[PDB]
Amino acid sequence: MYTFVVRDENSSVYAEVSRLLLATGQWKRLRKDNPRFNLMLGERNRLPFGRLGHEPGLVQLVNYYRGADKLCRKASLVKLIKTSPELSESCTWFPESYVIYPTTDEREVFLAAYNRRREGREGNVWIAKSSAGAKGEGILISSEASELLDFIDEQGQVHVIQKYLEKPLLLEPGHRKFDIRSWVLVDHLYNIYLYREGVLRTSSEPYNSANFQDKTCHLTNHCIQKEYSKNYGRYEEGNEMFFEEFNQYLMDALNTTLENSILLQIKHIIRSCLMCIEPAISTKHLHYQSFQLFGFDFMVDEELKVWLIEVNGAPACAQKLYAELCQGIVDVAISSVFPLADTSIFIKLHH
Amino acid sequence: MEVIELNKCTSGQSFEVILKPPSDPSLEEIQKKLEAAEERRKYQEAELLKHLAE
Amino acid sequence: MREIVHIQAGQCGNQIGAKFWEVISDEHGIDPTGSYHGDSDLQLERINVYYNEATGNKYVPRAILVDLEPGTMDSVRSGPFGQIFRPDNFVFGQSGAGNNWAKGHYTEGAELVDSVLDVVRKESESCDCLQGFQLTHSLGGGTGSGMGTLLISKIREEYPDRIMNTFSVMPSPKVSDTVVEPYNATLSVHQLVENTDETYCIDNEALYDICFRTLKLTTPTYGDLNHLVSATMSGVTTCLRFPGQLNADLRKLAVNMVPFPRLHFFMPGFAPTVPELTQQMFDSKNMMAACDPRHGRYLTVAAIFRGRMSMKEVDEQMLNVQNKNSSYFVEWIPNNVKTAVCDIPPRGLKMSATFIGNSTAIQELFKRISEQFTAMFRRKAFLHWYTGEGMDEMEFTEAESNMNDLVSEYQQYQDATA
Amino acid sequence: MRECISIHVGQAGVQIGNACWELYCLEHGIQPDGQMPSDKTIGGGDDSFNTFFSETGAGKHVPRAVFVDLEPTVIDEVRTGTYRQLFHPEQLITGKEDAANNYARGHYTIGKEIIDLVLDRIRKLADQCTGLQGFLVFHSFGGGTGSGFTSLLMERLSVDYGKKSKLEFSIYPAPQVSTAVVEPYNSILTTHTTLEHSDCAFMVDNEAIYDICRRNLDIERPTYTNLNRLISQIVSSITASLRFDGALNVDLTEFQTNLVPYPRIHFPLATYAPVISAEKAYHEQLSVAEITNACFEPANQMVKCDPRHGKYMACCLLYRGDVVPKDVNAAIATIKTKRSIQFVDWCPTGFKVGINYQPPTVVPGGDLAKVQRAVCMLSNTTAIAEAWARLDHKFDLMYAKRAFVHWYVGEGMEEGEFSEAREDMAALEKDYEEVGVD
Ligand SMILES: Nc1nc2c(ncn2[C@@H]2O[C@H](COP(=O)(O)OP(=O)(O)OP(=O)(O)O)[C@@H](O)[C@H]2O)c(=O)[nH]1
Ligand SMILES: CNCCCOc1cc(F)c(-c2c(Cl)nc3ncnn3c2N[C@@H](C)C(F)(F)F)c(F)c1
Ligand SMILES: Nc1ncnc2c1ncn2[C@@H]1O[C@H](COP(=O)(O)OP(=O)(O)CP(=O)(O)O)[C@@H](O)[C@H]1O
Ligand SMILES: Nc1nc2c(ncn2[C@@H]2O[C@H](COP(=O)(O)OP(=O)(O)O)[C@@H](O)[C@H]2O)c(=O)[nH]1
Ligand SMILES: [Ca+2]
Ligand SMILES: [Ca+2]
Ligand SMILES: [Ca+2]
Ligand SMILES: [Ca+2]
Ligand SMILES: [Mg+2]
Ligand SMILES: [Mg+2]
């Protein structure tokens, strides 16, 4: 039978993958530092990639891609977008963004374009973000550049500033904002599998163009709408709307599909992001092999243009779908290398 | 792709290929080290021989 | 050229020791006359480890035979190879030890020990580079136990920088032929804890079960038990007697097998495809110390395969048992299982596999003896025969405390995590 | 012409030395009896091959080599081997009790007893040198002699020859061929003691050599002889510039200046290609661009790591056989298109290239096929620090419980040398991180 170890115990996804592997009857769990494992469900930070693939007589597999950080963090993503020829500084699907450090830095880059559209009195509302902040904090929106990096020199972590989606597609009834989360699995062969089931994580209060103050009309994060929200849960339970019903809404309300209207842009952004880093993270001929589950975050404007806003390398799933996805991980990423004894839920994106 | 410092001879060739420009203890201390180790050994052998004499 | 001196004391030690010289003499192609008549010449490349070379290329075992009564040493002089030994290396008394450790260590044995170290000292000075000593003996009697450990302590005083190995027959859990064996065994264990580098623990109940259940001998004898031991003594010493490099001398073996100086008591095993042997070698029913390894964890392990076999398979099979049974190996000693392969097989077999485990499950043997010892010592039963030879009671207390400490240490490391 | 002296310490060091010297003799045309028919400077010469070979009036060519082990089993097979008459018995030195896989025993106990005789016999070879470059030291990390006595000798060579350069060829320990549980301890203790005395050290992880021999030579369970025959190849291609006419790495000092901009980070990664099995009926030659591209695949490295996740500070390319600069710059340009090759800011993104027209020499009967173009890559990449992370962790697991430490204290070493040596490699691992990571 096969062995595996668990080194990030607060992962909802791989907590359930662990439980399903044991129910196999063909997998046994050692503990943290027993090195004689077949599969490592590793930690999030400073995972020891250098110690994998050096155990004689054991094909070893890990659920993270060494190097996938340059895509799963904001500062890194913008540097990746603007410096990779494959993805262009003129990239169409990624919002105008600039890396800027508090106290290599595009701050004079940033206001060059700021005044350029003030001259044209075009929309000039930007947003600043970071990897450290959470809980809808360390986040701010406003129209005047002056005190938005008056606001990040007020901190000491690297933050990015990003043109704000001022005309987003807004669900009705409600006039409310939303995000789209798609889960993608990259297996050891670097097959790019897209989970057929996505989720729209929604805001439950009408989008107010007039003031950016209260960040529950603006920030679709699951927790701020669970936490500073009257009507969290009115239209859909948990501010979670799934693709079947979103498809019906776009059809009924705008005479278009989901697949046509949005999904083709998502699949294109995923291919482009992950094929750009394949030469740098592929483990095709490595002494160990990797797989990883990513969570892509998109936003849609009113013209049904899809924008990528970030990628999450240690993502959580939606409660209704933990069962289906987590077992897909087992069949495609784990049992692919470690066969067991005796339709599909993913969209393969070819390359 | 510059090819500088080319040198040739009957046995072969050498050259450089730029792609992009940029942006101890004393001898005395040693034996003092090996004598302090030899001391510690014999202190250990002595305590054993004393213990066995007991 | 890295010579060993072999000593055998007491009846058990001399019987086991005698058959040990039978087995390895045949392996090295030596006949009872001391003359070589073998096929290969790897039989002779390291013959100097155990044999002194003498006139007319007669090879004489570097062996010393000790007892307090002459009986058992007349038997060996009568045996198949009784004539191979140097007649001056028979060192014998007439009183006996009376199953009494005090007599063997302090009184009857004291009178004879200086003559034994006279022979040991002459052997040792005919050695180009003495490696160490190995002794075969019983712990339950009086000579091998009491005088055996006196010889050890006296040898350590003259050769404090040489290796000391023992093959030690220990009391069995259920079987005994003497009442006071718990006292003799405990007093000797205390000596071994402090003055040996490696001890192979053997008990007769395990050796018997193998003989009866496995090799299907209907009425096993000490002679059958003794051929088992001598076969596994040949195995554990193969890497010392034939050209190799893993565990090729006594000190290198000790460095790889003893992480902590007091935990140097080993579980020997023997067997009998290649997946066959490696499964046998690790089964409880194939080890000779009456401790089940699944009740502890291996600190280190040494596996020795003999014969001609696909070393690729052997390498693959040992890896599988480790990765299959990781729970039984300490995680804080990386790569603690080492494998050696020698081409010359034992006689009768074609592929051997002898096992040397340093398992914390050896704890069970010392707790068996400790429980017996205490049940007698709490009432001072039979003790007057020991204090009657001059011993103090505190010598028994100290021996009891040390063997109980040893058990706590084994449990400490059985529990440790990374 | 300046001379180099090779020192072979311990079993691994000696057996690898004897494979290197047999290979040198075939490459230069020296026979087992030391006679060089092609040499017309009798009893003398300042030819570049004289950097490694002395010359007798009788016409024999003697390696500038000293072999030392503290037990005689290994060195005596040199005294009886087919190249026995190559050496003077004074170049071979034996103890009789070895270090028992115990660093402290080879360094303190036994090393003290023999170090002065080794220096004398080294001095006798240095005496007949008109201008000594330095020393190339071959040893293992795991052995007691390889680790313990080697570090003591480097300390002494740094004073008896304070200005000369010292290069290391070190065998990193791999469990599939390793002899002792304590090799992590011996590796760390000797690396700490030797680090400030080594100018440039090429470490070979026996694991990588082992699996190359399995995968590319179809040897199902490789021996030391198979490992050493491939190792000698890589060694020879690295030393070829000292023994043949050229203008790159013609001096031990050049190795450091070309490859080691940071004194502590003196561990270049070697990658070799092509390794082709000689019994395979035959193969169609590989391009210059193909073997050059093989040099960036981890399966061809002497140490298995991922250079993509670090930074280079130097890179040399050593070709042997049918190669010309045109095909090289074509391979490099096209290979920088498809590979992740990131240098440090502080250094130019470039390759020093050397070509020797003599195609690689192979030993008769060996498992490696005669090719007509081979390449060895020397890259100083921070990714090799993965090898220190592996060892440091094995060291940590055992040392947390003081497993086996009593064997070292018993030899007169103090427990504090353990912590001292471990803190040094903790620093080293972090130095490697500041350089190659953001
Ligand atoms: N590649 C290669 N590795 C070797 C060779 N000999 C030994 N080793 C490796 O080196 C380690 C053992 O060290 P040795 O060189 O045998 O020990 P030593 O230097 O002679 O020191 P002591 O015998 O302890 O005095 C193990 O990791 C072996 O795998 C060899 O000939 N070639
Ligand atoms: C199912 N688990 C039961 C294991 C049985 O374990 C054993 C071990 C032995 F060593 C013997 C044995 C032998 Cl084999 N030969 C002998 N010659 C002289 N005495 N003697 C022996 N024992 C003496 C004490 C006795 F006979 F008085 F019992 C034996 F019989 C059973
Ligand atoms: N350029 C932009 N324009 C408009 N809205 C934006 C935006 N960038 C982000 N947002 C909104 O602000 C919210 C928070 O941004 P962000 O996704 O980076 O925080 P986060 O890192 O906590 C998401 P997760 O918790 O999934 O990792 C997003 O849900 C998005 O709706
Ligand atoms: N295997 C084996 N064990 C023996 C033999 N003789 C005695 N023993 C064991 O040792 C004990 C008796 O010890 P013995 O050697 O006679 O005592 P000694 O002569 O005083 O050293 C009993 O527990 C037996 O199990 C023998 O020939 N073979
Ligand atoms: Ca008397
Ligand atoms: Ca006397
Ligand atoms: Ca000449
Ligand atoms: Ca120096
Ligand atoms: Mg985030
Ligand atoms: Mg050696």
Contacting partners of chain A (3+ CB pairs under 8 A): C, D
Span from the CA of A138 to the centroid of ligand 3 (angstroms): 11
Whole-angstrom Cα distance, residue A30 to residue C29? Answer: 49
By three-state DSSP, how is residue C383 classified?
Answer: coil
C171: which DSSP letter? P
Is the beta carbon of C220 within 6 A of some atom in ligand 2?
Answer: yes
Whole-angstrom Cα distance, residue D118 to residue D141? Answer: 20
In a domain, A329, yes or no: yes
Asked whether the beta carbons of residue A33 and residue C323 sit closer than 8 angstroms, the reply is: no
Domain coordinates of chain C in residue numbers? Answer: 1-259, 260-361, 362-418
Count of CB atoms within 10 A of residue D415's CB? 13
Catalytic positions of D are: 254
For residue A288, how far is the Cα from the chain centroid? Answer: 25
Residue D162's closest chain B neighbor by CA? B24
In a domain, A239, yes or no: yes
C21: nearest Cα among C302, C190, C237: C237
Whole-angstrom Cα distance, residue A290 to residue A281? Answer: 9
> A23, A39, A62 — which closes off a domain?
A62
Residue A318 sits at φ, ψ, to 5 deg, of -95, 140
D101, D175, D220 member nearest C255 (Cβ): D101
Residue C129 sits at φ, ψ, to 5 deg, of -160, 85
Residue C150's closest chain B neighbor by CA? B52
Whole-angstrom Cα distance, residue D161 to residue A226? Answer: 74
Residue D342's closest chain A neighbor by CA? A280
- Which atom of ligand 1 approaches the CA of D179 most closely? 26
Instruction: State the method.
Output: X-ray
Asked whether the beta carbons of residue A33 and residue C418 sit closer than 8 angstroms, the reply is: yes
Whole-angstrom Cα distance, residue D24 to residue C352? Answer: 42
Are the beta carbons of D292 and D328 closer than 8 angstroms? yes
By three-state DSSP, how is residue D37 classified?
Answer: coil
Span from the CA of A94 to the centroid of ligand 3 (angstroms): 13
By three-state DSSP, how is residue C198 classified?
Answer: strand
Whole-angstrom Cα distance, residue C110 to residue B49? Answer: 19
CATH number, domain of A318, equals: 3.30.470.20
Is the beta carbon of C226 within 6 A of some atom in ligand 2?
Answer: no
CATH number, domain of A44, equals: 3.40.50.11480
Specify whether A200 is located in the same domain as A53: no
Residue D260 sits at φ, ψ, to 5 deg, of -125, 80
* R_g of chain C computed on alpha carbons: 20
Q: What residue numbers of C does the annotated binding site cover?
A: 11-12, 97-99, 138, 141-144, 175-177, 181, 204, 222, 226
* Nearest ligand, CA A139: 3
The one-letter amino acid code at D18 reads N
Distance from A2 to chain C by nearest Cα, in Å? 9
The bridge status of strand B12-20 relative to strand C352-359 is unpaired
Nearby residues of D302 by Cβ (< 8 Å), 6 or more positions away: D202, D203, D204, D205, D208, D209, D234, D269, D270, D271, D272
Angle, CA of D383, D388 and D389, to the nearest 5°: 85
Contacting partners of chain D (3+ CB pairs under 8 A): A, B, C
A–D interface: beta-carbon pairs under 8 A = 39
A62: nearest Cα among A41, A37, A32: A41
Asked whether the beta carbons of residue C251 and residue D100 sit closer than 8 angstroms, the reply is: yes
> A42, A62, A82 — which closes off a domain?
A62
In a domain, A80, yes or no: no
By three-state DSSP, how is residue C303 classified?
Answer: strand
- Which residues of chain C neighbour B52 with C-beta distances below 8 Å? 153, 156-157
Distance from B48 to chain D by nearest Cα, in Å? 12
Q: What is the resolution of this structure in A?
A: 2.4
- Which residues does residue D368 pair with via DSSP β-bridges, in sequence order? D277
C231: nearest Cα among C211, C248, C212, C251: C211
What is the enclosing helix (H) or strand (E) of C208? helix C204-209
HSE-up of A12 (CA within 13 Å, CB side)?
A: 10
Strands (E), A176-323: 178-186, 192-195, 199-202, 240-242, 289-290, 292-300, 306-312
Whole-angstrom Cα distance, residue D176 to residue B54? Answer: 47
Are the beta carbons of D341 and D349 closer than 8 angstroms? yes
Tokens 């992740």 belong to residue? D340
- Three-state SS for A316-339 is CCCHHHHHHHHHHHHHHHHCCCCC
Q: Residues C213-230, buried b or exposed e (16+ Cβ, 10 A)?
A: eeeeeeebeeebbbbbbb
Residue A201 sits at φ, ψ, to 5 deg, of -90, 120
Whole-angstrom Cα distance, residue D102 to residue C252? Answer: 9
Distance from C157 to chain B by nearest Cα, in Å? 6
Span from the CA of C3 to the centroid of ligand 6 (angstroms): 24
Domain that holds residue A186: 68-72+168-349
Contacting partners of chain B (3+ CB pairs under 8 A): C, D
In a domain, A291, yes or no: yes
Whole-angstrom Cα distance, residue C399 to residue C190? Answer: 5
Residue A37's closest chain C neighbor by CA? C323
The tokens for C280 are 């046998």
Question: Does C153 touch chain B if contact means CB atoms closer than 8 Å?
Answer: yes
- Which atom of ligand 3 approaches the CA of A312 most closely? 27
In a domain, A79, yes or no: no
Virtual torsion, Cα C359, C363, C366, C368, nearest 10 deg: -120
Are the beta carbons of A144 and A166 closer than 8 angstroms? no
Asked if residue C272 has a cis previous peptide bond (ω within 30° of 0), the answer is yes
Mutation for A interface: C323, C325, C415, most A CBs within 10 A: C323
Distance from A151 to chain D by nearest Cα, in Å? 25
Whole-angstrom Cα distance, residue D181 to residue C333? Answer: 8
- Which residues of chain A neighbour C326 with C-beta distances below 8 Å? 3, 30, 34, 36
What is the enclosing helix (H) or strand (E) of D28? helix D10-28
Specify whether A321 is located in the same domain as A188: yes
- Which residues does residue D135 pair with via DSSP β-bridges, in sequence order? D5, D166
For residue C33, how far is the Cα from the chain centroid? Answer: 26
The tokens for C51 are 């044999």
Which residues of chain A have a Cβ shorter than 8 Å from any chain C Cβ?
3, 30-36, 56-58
Nearby residues of D119 by Cβ (< 8 Å), 6 or more positions away: D153, D156, D160
A30, A34, A56 member nearest C319 (Cβ): A56
Are the beta carbons of A142 and A125 closer than 8 angstroms? yes
Task: Count the residues in chain C.
Answer: 418
Cα A317 to Cα A180, A263, A344, C223, distances in angstroms: 12, 19, 19, 70
Are the beta carbons of D158 and D198 closer than 8 angstroms? no
Distance from D80 to chain B by nearest Cα, in Å? 35
HSE-up of D118 (CA within 13 Å, CB side)?
A: 28
Q: Is the dihedral angle over the CA atoms C171, C177, C181, C184 positive or is it negative?
A: negative
Task: Count the residues in chain A.
Answer: 351
Whole-angstrom Cα distance, residue D208 to residue D300? Answer: 8
Is the beta carbon of C140 within 6 A of some atom in ligand 4?
Answer: yes
In a domain, A290, yes or no: yes
The one-letter amino acid code at C66 reads V
In a domain, A156, yes or no: no
The tokens for C11 are 């009846």
> A44, A62, A80 — which closes off a domain?
A62
Are the beta carbons of D270 and D376 closer than 8 angstroms? yes
In a domain, A16, yes or no: yes
Question: Does C315 touch chain B if contact means CB atoms closer than 8 Å?
Answer: no
Q: Any residues with Cβ below 6 Å from ligand 3, and which?
A: A 95, 127, 129, 134, 162-165, 179, 219-221, 297, 299, 309-310, 312
Q: Which residues surround the ion ligand 7 when the cut-off is CB under 5 Å?
A: D 39, 41, 45
Q: Ligand 4: which of C138, C172, C201 to mutate, most ligand atoms within 8 Å of CB?
A: C138
Whole-angstrom Cα distance, residue C109 to residue C115? Answer: 10
- Which residues of chain A neighbour D389 with C-beta distances below 8 Å? 48, 50-51
The bridge status of strand D349-356 relative to strand B12-20 is antiparallel
By three-state DSSP, how is residue B19 classified?
Answer: strand
By three-state DSSP, how is residue D352 classified?
Answer: strand
Domain count, chain A: 2
Whole-angstrom Cα distance, residue C248 to residue D144? Answer: 14
